[PDB]
Amino acid sequence: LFTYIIYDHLSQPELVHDYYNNYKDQYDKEKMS
Amino acid sequence: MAMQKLFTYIYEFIEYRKMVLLEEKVPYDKFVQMVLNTGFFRINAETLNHGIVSVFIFGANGKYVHHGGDMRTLLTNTLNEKKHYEELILIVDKPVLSKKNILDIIVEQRAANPTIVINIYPYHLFCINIPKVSAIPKHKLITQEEAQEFLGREYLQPQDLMQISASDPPVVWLGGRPGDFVQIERPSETAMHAVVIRFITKSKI
Amino acid sequence: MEAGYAEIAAVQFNIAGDNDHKRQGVMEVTISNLFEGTLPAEGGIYDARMGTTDHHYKCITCSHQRKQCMGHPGILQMHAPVLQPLFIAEIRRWLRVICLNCGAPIVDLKRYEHLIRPKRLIEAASSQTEGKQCYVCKAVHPKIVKDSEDYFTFWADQQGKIDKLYPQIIREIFSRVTYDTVVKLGRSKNSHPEKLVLKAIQIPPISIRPGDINNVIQYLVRKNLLIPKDLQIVRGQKIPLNIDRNLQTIQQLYYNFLLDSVSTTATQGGTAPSIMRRLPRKEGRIRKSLLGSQVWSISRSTICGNSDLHLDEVGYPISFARTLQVAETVQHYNINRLMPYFLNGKRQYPGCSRVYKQITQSVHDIEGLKQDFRLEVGDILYRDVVTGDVAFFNRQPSLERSSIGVHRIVVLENPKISTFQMNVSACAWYNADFDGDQMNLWVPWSVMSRVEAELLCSVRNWFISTKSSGPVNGQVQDSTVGSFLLTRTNTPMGKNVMNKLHAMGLFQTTQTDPPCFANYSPTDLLDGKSVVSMLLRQTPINYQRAPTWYSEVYAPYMHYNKQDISTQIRNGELIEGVLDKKAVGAGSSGGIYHLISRRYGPQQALKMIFATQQLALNYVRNAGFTVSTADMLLTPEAHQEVQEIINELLLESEEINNRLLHGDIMPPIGLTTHDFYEKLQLNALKFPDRILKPIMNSINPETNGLFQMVATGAKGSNPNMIHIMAGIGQIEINTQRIQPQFSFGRTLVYYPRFALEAQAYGFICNSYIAGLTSPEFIFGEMNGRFDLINKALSTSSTGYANRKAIFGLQSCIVDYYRRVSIDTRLVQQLYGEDGLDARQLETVRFETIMLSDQELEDKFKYTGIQSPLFEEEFSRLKKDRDKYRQIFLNVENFNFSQLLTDVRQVPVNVASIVKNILLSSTSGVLPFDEKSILQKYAMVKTFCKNLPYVFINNIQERLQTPIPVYLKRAASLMRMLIRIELATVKTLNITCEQMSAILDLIRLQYTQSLINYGEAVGILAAQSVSEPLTQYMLDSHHRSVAGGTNKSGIVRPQEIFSAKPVEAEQSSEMLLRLKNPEVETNKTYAQEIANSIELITFERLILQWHLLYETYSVMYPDFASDVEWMTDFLENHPLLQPPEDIANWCIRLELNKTTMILKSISLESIINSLRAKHPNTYIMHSVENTASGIPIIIRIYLRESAFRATDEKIAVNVVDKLLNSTIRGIPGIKNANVVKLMRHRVDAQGKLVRLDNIYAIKTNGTNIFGAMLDDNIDPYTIVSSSIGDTMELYGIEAARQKIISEIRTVMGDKGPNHRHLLMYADLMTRTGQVTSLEKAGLNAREPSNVLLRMALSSPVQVLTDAAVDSAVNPIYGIAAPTLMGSVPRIGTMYSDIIMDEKYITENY
Amino acid sequence: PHKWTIYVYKAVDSSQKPAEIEVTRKDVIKKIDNHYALADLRCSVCHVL
Amino acid sequence: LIMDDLVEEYVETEEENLVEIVESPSICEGFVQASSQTLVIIPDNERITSNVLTTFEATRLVAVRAQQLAINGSTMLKKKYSSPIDIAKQELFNRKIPLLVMRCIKVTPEGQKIVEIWNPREMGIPLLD
Ligand SMILES: [Mg+2]
Ligand SMILES: [Zn+2]
Ligand SMILES: [Zn+2]
């Protein structure tokens, strides 16, 4: 689809975030330390 | 990606010089295998004047560009064959043009064979179709008669003209020699293109 | 007798030996006495034979007085020889290359018989040659040692045997050198080393040593008298103690006489201004006395405004008019006119002061000529300056071609006025203002100078800028506001009308013939448009442009009158709209005054400017105009609205701060968190567009004086009003906020460390009218001090760059072929590539460029006659359009943001000529006539074919001689414009005779636009490009200063002009286009490519590294725990077991996980970018699973194949080589962003469409080769800001185009005409290499022009090299003739005048 | 984020029939006369005054 | 002991980079005079320069004529003007100027000064009046 910037179509932005949330969380934890 | 661009573009350099190809054409992989093993690749081309032009594509890590004696031996052997040999082109890496010793053997070989044209060029000279570059205006060699009539009308000597090096990439692709004249159609933002004639001087190296 | 007139054509520089001194000396100095009473002592240094400097005696040598005597040199026969101080280095070079016994060259001359002549001796002396054996006398060459105690003593070192090389011994050595050796070493026969030792020095003429420099000469003579005259020093003589000291002090005295306090690179050695100290620097001989001069007959005063003076007039105080005089020679035609001046004399104005009687050949006082009654023919009368005389007006610094202008003198008879009064509209010529500025005024007194002042230098010639090709003068300040107030439809009082009496009063001071108001009743009402039309009907022009008054940012507020937002003038009648800066303002290209100058001449334009200024001022004399404090005061509701807007800005800033606090700010690839945070804060604190809403809610635009000045363009801008009324906002210095310089993390003592509020970093929340707090005032003072510093150093930087550019370009002069040449060597085949003057151009739209294939046929394909001629005409038009599109789309391809434009600057506006002829035509809609239409087509075709003959003459046009190709190309644009505007469809109501008139007018206008022979176009280009440089400085605090984008100051222009290499560039950029036209639209793909080509090295990702002397198949104790992941790597990589050539050396590097995360760098990327990169290596990594707390460790084990110098040092060098390996990207690219590109492409319908949806990579740093190697970038459209990179990869022509583009980028929107950039680029690329504008560029371009290079800089070295090399300096250009006291052969002197002997004989 | 690019104009006189015109910045000059006054700004995303 | 008037020692740092055999004859050394030139006037039909006076050329012609009328004054003009500048300007406008314009096209090495001679009385005048 087109999910890089839209975020208003829902569903597709949500699956991507939920199925890569913890990687982003741990990377944020490592970066700010 | 220097070797790939060299391989694809040296043959259009030869064709743009209006030279008929000799021997055959080899695949890319065999080309780099020869470059790594022998230390260089040789391409032979024939000019319209029945002369022979030899292009030597040396390798960046090849032994021929690290020891002067090897380059001397190669030049002496190649110049010792039986061919007209209008021009020798040696394509090397950019730092090779800075290693003074190799340039010294090049100068010595050039002095040894005055009738033979030896020029050493960097990789970037044949890594793109130079005449098709947008920033490069159209260069064209004009015969000595046209240049003489132009100079006679203008009351000018060839030394009064703007100069251009024989190692200039458009001039190299044209095959212009020092003492020749090149007509350049340059785009103009005041007159919507213009024509300039430049005098070809000694090539850098 | 009768010394005939002559001119110096060339100057020869040589080393002056003692023979030359003996030949040229008029006398021999023998005594130390100075004066014998009141007269010079004979034989002394003051002896009169050397010239006279005092009125008390004549010369003797030339029998002249002090004024007419140029001075003559003398001789001092030195008892012991001295070395020439300027050529000590030459003596040293000669001593090291020839045998000191027989004079034979110790070096092999055949070795250096391939170098150029100026280098043979330098390389011969470079070789050691110590201990070499002569092949003639079998002697051993000693070590030539230069004494470190002085600049002249030489020591002979023979294996420790130390003996002093005295000048006598050196002369004995140098006299044995043959001329064969001198020639074979590259030296001239006039540069024999025997001339380097002087036994007879030249005492200079007294003309250059007036009655200290004579103390040195007296001391030298006194010390020379001490040395015995028979002193004969040979090699190894042991001069005991006192002759040695005397010789040393004599040599030191001579060296200080010539070269005291001047070093020069050629100075060998160590440890009363001298002769050579007088030359260099601003106060030196050259710059202060030769390049400039103090003059007589000149005045200076403060300048003030006078609106009652015309633009070409200057107010001259009467006291100055009786001081400066005009020399009028009395003849039969002027005796009656000059008699009143003679009668008035010195008692009444206008009078005279001096009379030069021809019979006595002398000047007579006017008070002694009371008995002369009248004046004789041939007498010269010096009369007072009167009204109508021409004067040269000049304001320093003189940076523009209009910095000196000629005005008609208006003598102010009020004795209390001491200022130079001028019209405020004339200030644009001089960049002057009436706040203390002083201007120089001198009245030409000679006839030739007066002719030239009134014919060549009058300010009417400078109405059109030579730089911008546009108008210079116009309405300013009160005149712009007055024009707006007079031409507006409504006032607060109703309709803007006046009665007949006040309409007449508007023309009281216009100085023109008044219009007729007899058809107006006393109660009749006249609007301002009516009186403006009454004035402008004298020079009818056509104008149609939106005024500055109508601004879209103002449109939502206010209520614009529909009759005020569309200014239209038809044949001099103002129909609608207001007149403001766009129409009548100074410098307004396309304004009414520009059109008046184009159709009726710049004198008419200046007269119209004065008339309209008088109209506007007379209108304001009744309307009134003011500004008050209440004009800048917001209403309380508007103040609350502004506070709310600033609260929203600070709330966005606080949201960014809250994101930072929670660790939510993730910088993109290429920026650190600090840089990304600063960028976010800078974006958040910008004022919105709706900040104008409270301002305009508080402002009555029909009444607000401040808003009226800002909106009409008279003064100020929108940011000024916003700062005054709403708020200043964020203080930005060099694109960034206030740096924390008070302490670590503190910006001021008033804010805490690591403060996150926007106010702590320069955000000013208060307006000027509200008042600033102390920290806000401190930040504002920092910004203002930045402005002051930039303004101060702009003058100096512009002076440096301007002087360098002038000296690099001054020799460029238009010749009789209208080429530009340095002496005889070509720079341009035709000036500006079109052979046109920059003052004779007009911007004109080409209607066919954007038309598709169908609208081109529907608008230009004439179908009224079934003839192939019109098919050919339409084909010609289409081919012209295609050629234009191809050329200017190619231009788009090698530029960053140079868009194809529909308008061009052309000498002739053909459409305007056609419109004027049609308007003046006494006909209309002519009946169809096939013969007439075909005849007109044939005439237009022939005129286009013969157009390039305006570049030659009518004779060659009549003979139809062949036209050179470049001259055919020069007329291409005008041929295009003529074929467009004189197409058959457009010329249906034009008769054949009207077509002939149109063609004749076009030919006349084209001829009038050509550049004159002998123009100093190089100096014009230097001025036109150096003038925008001070404005480029004035915005130095608005430009980035950080590394990789350093554009502050003159860094970029000095990079361009000095031809600095790629490694010396601080703001290198590149533009890359994707090699796929259909996927340039995807922003994500562009970002992918940009982040892919960004250069990442191993060092970028290393936290720390440790090299170890341990092999593997012991271990530093601090990392003994590494063997766990080491064995894990061994288990997980079965085909990566350690090889059987593992050596002791090995690096252990800790990877930075933060950088790896931020740069999206994976461990596998490192492992494969190092393994398939490095041949003699064995690399091992930890298990990448590492979380925060356990690190990724990379142990790279070396092999003896690398070691195949100290082992540890080469191992460290291998470490350095491994660290600098390219993990990702292309070398030289620090950053790579994604930009939206605007480009034109021709679609399938033949239409030219502007596309905004193109994505490209704008990298930081340049690598044309690397960018062309990757297959995701179009290789044929690589644009790099680096001139050197372009030259090295593309050639000299592309380098010239790159110089043009980079200079254009530096100049900006308000840049000079393109021909000046062409001049700069063509001068710099004329030799086939990119030469600079520094001394090196001059040396490469004009090596023979010794005088020009001395005048530029470093006169001592240039003079020494010229003397050594026997340089011949042909006299050409400006600097060389000026240094020789002559005049440049350009301008009026370019063509010489001879007498028409036949005509004079046959018409006496 | 809010984008206040819509201008809302209220008719000064009740005789003005439309009594409400919403325009962009480039349409004010061709759709708004002195019979209207700027009343509020409407967002181009949330359509909220 | 304190001296104030120092001279500020001056330094040049950028060095220039310009790029049988008997004692001397009376020919190689000497002959500074430069050989005389012959005036090769281009024929009127071979001239390539403009038939219009440049503003430089017209200004120089007017200045020379007015300066000559300053010492002389025998004029062929019909109307009487009280200044030499006006007289010279009208002489140029009335095509009565007694001067000629020589445009030195080229000086040849062989010793020829190739010139074009132009008559201002058959030329275009760009000046104002
Ligand atoms: Mg001032
Ligand atoms: Zn004298
Ligand atoms: Zn010897």
Q: Is C795 helix (H, G, I), strand (E, B) or coil?
A: helix
**Interface contact A33, partner C, CB < 8 A:** yes
C-alpha separations of C1260 from C101, C635, C1226 in Å: 63, 48, 11
Cα C947 from Cα C1007, distance rounded (Å): 10
D6-11 and B20-21 strand pairing: unpaired
Cα C430 to ligand 1 centre (Å): 11
What CA–CA distances, in Å, run from C299 to B171, C306, C402, C439? Answer: 59, 19, 19, 8
B-E C-beta contacts closer than 8 Å: 4
Is the CB of C1084 inside 8 Å of chain A's CB atoms?
Answer: yes
User: What's the full length of chain E, in residues?
Assistant: 129
**What are the Cα distances from residue C1394, in Å, to C1012, E76, E101?**
20, 18, 6
Query: How close is the nearest chain A Cα to the Cα of C668, in Å?
Result: 13
Contact yes or no for D25 and C555 at CB 8 A: yes
C-beta atoms of C1157 and A4 within 8 A: no
Alpha-carbon distances, residue C923 vs C110, C857, C912, C918, C929 (angstroms)? 88, 28, 18, 8, 15
Q: Please tell me what DSSP assigns to residue C302.
A: E
Kindly list the distances between the CA atom of residue E19 and the CA atoms of C641, C1330, C1337, C1343, in Å, as whole numbers in the listed order. 71, 16, 12, 8
From the CA of C58, the nearest ligand is 2
User: Between chains, do C1188 and A4 touch, taking CB under 8 Å as contact?
Assistant: no
Tell me if C1325 and B162 make a contact (CB, 8 A cut-off). Answer: yes
CA distance C107 to C124: 7
Which residues touch C1106 (CB under 8 Å, ≥6 apart)? Answer: C1116, C1119, C1147, C1148, C1149
Residue B3 to chain E, least CA–CA distance (Å): 37
**CB proximity C717 to A under 8 Å:** no
Identify the nearest ligand to the CA of C48 by its number: 2
Backbone CA torsion sign across C1304, C1309, C1311, C1314? positive
Residue C36: count of CB within 10 angstroms of its CB: 12
d(CA C708, CA C549): 8
Handedness of CA C442, C445, C446, C451 (dihedral sign): positive
DSSP-based helix, strand, coil % in chain A, nearest 5 = 55, 0, 45
Ligand nearest to the CA of residue C138, numbered in listed order = 3
DSSP-derived secondary structure letter, C925:
S
Residue among B146, B186, E54, E122 nearest C962 (CA): B146
Q: Which of residues 139-158 of B touch C (CB under 8 A)?
A: 139, 150, 153-154, 156-157
Rounded to the nearest angstrom, the distance between the alpha carbon of C177 and the centre of ligand 3 is 11
Residue B16 and residue C1152: Cα distance in Å, rounded? Answer: 51
CA distance C70 to C85: 25
Alpha helices in C1252-1354 (DSSP H): 1264-1269, 1283-1289, 1292-1307, 1314-1324, 1335-1341, 1346-1352
The amino acid sitting at C1221 is S
CB C158 within 8 A of CB C141: no
Q: Can you tell me the distance from the alpha carbon of C1365 to that of C1360, in angstroms, rounded to the nearest whole number?
A: 9
Q: Assign A30 to helix, strand or coil.
A: helix
Q: Does E42 touch chain B (CB under 8 A)?
A: no
CA distance A19 to chain C (A): 19
Contact at 8 Å (CB) between C142 and C130?
A: yes
The Cβ of residue B12 has, within 10 Å, a number of other Cβ atoms equal to 16
Please answer whether residues B197 and B150 qualify as being in contact, where contact means their C-beta atoms are separated by less than 8 angstroms: yes
Tell me whether C863 touches chain A (CB under 8 Å): no
Q: Is residue C1185 within 8 angstroms of chain A, CB to CB?
A: no
By CA distance, what is C963's nearest residue in E? E48
Q: Tell me how far the alpha carbon of residue E77 lies from the centroid of ligand 2, in angstroms.
A: 47
Chains near C (3 or more Cβ pairs under 8 Å) = A, B, D, E
Q: Which chain B residues contact residue E48 at CB under 8 A? A: 153
Residue B46 DSSP code: E
Q: Encode C713-781 in three state secondary structure.
A: CCCCCHHHHHHHHCCCEECCECCECCCCCCECCECCCCCCCCCCCHHHHCEECCCCCCCCCHHHHHHHH
Put simply, whether B76 touches C (Cβ < 8 Å) is: no
Residues in chain D: 49
Please give the distance of CA E22 from its chain centroid, rounded to a whole number. Answer: 41
Give the minimum alpha-carbon distance from D33 to chain C in angstroms, rounded to a whole number: 7
- Gap from CA of C7 to ligand 2 centroid (Å): 22
Q: How was this structure determined?
A: cryo-EM
The end-to-end CA distance of chain B, in Å, is: 26
A32 touches chain C (CB under 8 A): yes
Instruction: Quote the DSSP letter at residue C497.
Output: E
- Rounded CA separation B138/B173 (Å): 11
SS3 C155: strand
Residues of chain E positioned with their CB less than 8 A from the CB of B153: 48
Q: How close C1349 gets to chain B, by Cα (Å)? A: 21
B25 at E interface, C-beta within 8 A: no
Q: C899, C892 in Cβ contact below 8 A?
A: yes
Region class of C577: left (phi > 0), else alpha (psi between -120 and 50), else beta: left
Torsion of CA C705, C710, C712, C713, to 10 degrees: 140
R_g (Cα) of chain A, nearest Å: 12
Are the beta carbons of C1180 and C1126 closer than 8 angstroms? Answer: yes
In this structure, what DSSP letter does residue C434 have?
Answer: T
Query: To probe the interface with E, which of B151, B155, B157 has the most E CB atoms within 10 Å?
Result: B155
Amino acid at A28: D
Alpha-carbon gap, residue B145 to B151, rounded angstroms: 10
Calculate the alpha carbon distances from C8 to C76, C278, C1146, C1383 in Å.
30, 24, 75, 10
Close Cβ partners of C320 (under 8 Å, ≥ 6 residues apart): C299, C301, C385, C441
Contact E17, C1332 (CB under 8 A): no
Q: Is B98 on the interface with C (CB under 8 A)?
A: no
Q: What is the dihedral of CA C4, C10, C15, C21, to 10 degrees?
A: 0
Round to whole Å and give the CA distance between C529 and B140. Answer: 60
Q: Please name the helix (run of DSSP H) or strand (run of DSSP E) that holds residue C172, with its range, or none.
A: helix C167-174
Contacts of C560 in chain D (CB under 8 A): 29
Give the whole-angstrom CA distance, residue C823 versus residue C827.
10
Distances (CA, A) of C817 to B157, C824, C1106, E114, E118: 15, 12, 71, 14, 15
**Nearest residue to C252 (alpha-carbon basis) of C230, C278, C274, C277:** C274
Hey, is C140 helix, strand or coil?
strand
- Integer Cα distance of C1105 and C1212 in angstroms: 11
Query: Hey, what are C627's tokens?
Result: 């500004």
Chain B CB contacts of C1276 under 8 Å are 128-129, 132-134
Flag whether C touches B (3+ CB pairs, 8 A cutoff). yes
Residue C350: cis peptide before it, omega within 30 degrees of 0: yes
Question: Is C1314's Cβ below 8 Å from some Cβ in B?
Answer: yes
DSSP letter (8 states) at residue C513: P
Residues 151-180, chain B, touching E (beta carbon < 8 A): 153, 155
Measure the CA dihedral B82/B83/B87/B88, to 10°. Answer: -50
Segment (H or E) for C890: helix C868-893
Chain C residues within an 8 Å CB radius of A28: 663-664, 666
Residue numbers of A between 10 and 29 with CB closer than 8 Å to C: 26-29
Contacts of C552 in chain D (CB under 8 A): 25-26, 29
**Secondary structure element (H or E) that encloses residue C1257, with its range:** strand C1248-1260
Cα-to-centroid distance, C439 and ligand 1 (Å): 11
B34, amino acid identity: M
- State the resolution, in angstroms: 2.4
Specify the residue for token string 């001679």: E117
CB burial of C555-574 (b: ≥16 within 10 Å; e: otherwise) equals bbbbbbbeebbebebeebeb
Please tell me if residue C663 touches chain A, with a CB cutoff of 8 Å.
yes
Distance (Å, whole) CA C676 – CA C452: 62
Tokens of A33: 């330390």
Task: Please compute, for residue C1089, the number of CA atoms within 13 A of its CA located in the half-sphere on the CB side.
Answer: 25
Count Cα neighbours of C331 within 13 Å in the Cβ-side half-sphere.
Answer: 21
B52 touches chain C (CB under 8 A): no
Residue C550 to residue D29, Cβ atoms within 8 A:
yes
Cβ-based contacts under 8 A for chains C and D = 25
Long-range Cβ pairs for the range C943-951 (8 Å, 24+): C943/C978, C943/C999, C943/C1002, C943/C1003, C944/C975, C944/C978, C944/C979, C947/C971, C947/C974, C947/C975, C947/C978, C947/C1006, C950/C1003, C950/C1006, C950/C1007, C950/C1010, C951/C818, C951/C830, C951/C835, C951/C1010
C1191 and C1105 in contact (C-beta within 8 Å)?
Answer: no
Cis peptide before C444 (omega within 30 of 0): no
Residues of E in contact with B154 (CB under 8 A): none
Cβ neighbours around C1041 below 10 Å, total: 17
Report the helix count and the strand count for chain C, using DSSP H and E: 49, 44
Could you tell me which residues come within 8 angstroms of residue C1130 by beta carbon, excluding any fewer than 6 positions away? Answer: C1137
DSSP string, C1178-1189: EEEE--TT--TT
φ, ψ for residue D20, nearest 5 deg: -160, 115
C135 alpha carbon to ligand 3 midpoint, in Å? 7
For residue C431, the CA-to-ligand 1 centroid distance in Å is 9
Q: Which of C1363, C1305, C1296 is nearest to C1330 (CA)?
A: C1296
Say whether C903 sits in a helix, a strand or coil: strand
Instruction: Choose the mutation target among E42, E106, E115, E116 for the interface with B, i.e. most B CBs under 10 Å.
Output: E106
Chain E residue with minimal CA distance to B155?
Answer: E106
Using CA atoms, how far apart are residues C1291 and C1286, in angstroms rounded to an integer?
Answer: 7
Distance from CA of C536 to the nearest CA of D (A): 29
Parallel/antiparallel/unpaired status of strands C1069-1073 and C1279-1280: antiparallel
C894 in Cβ contact with C1301 (< 8 Å): yes
The amino acid present at C1153, given as its one-letter code, is K
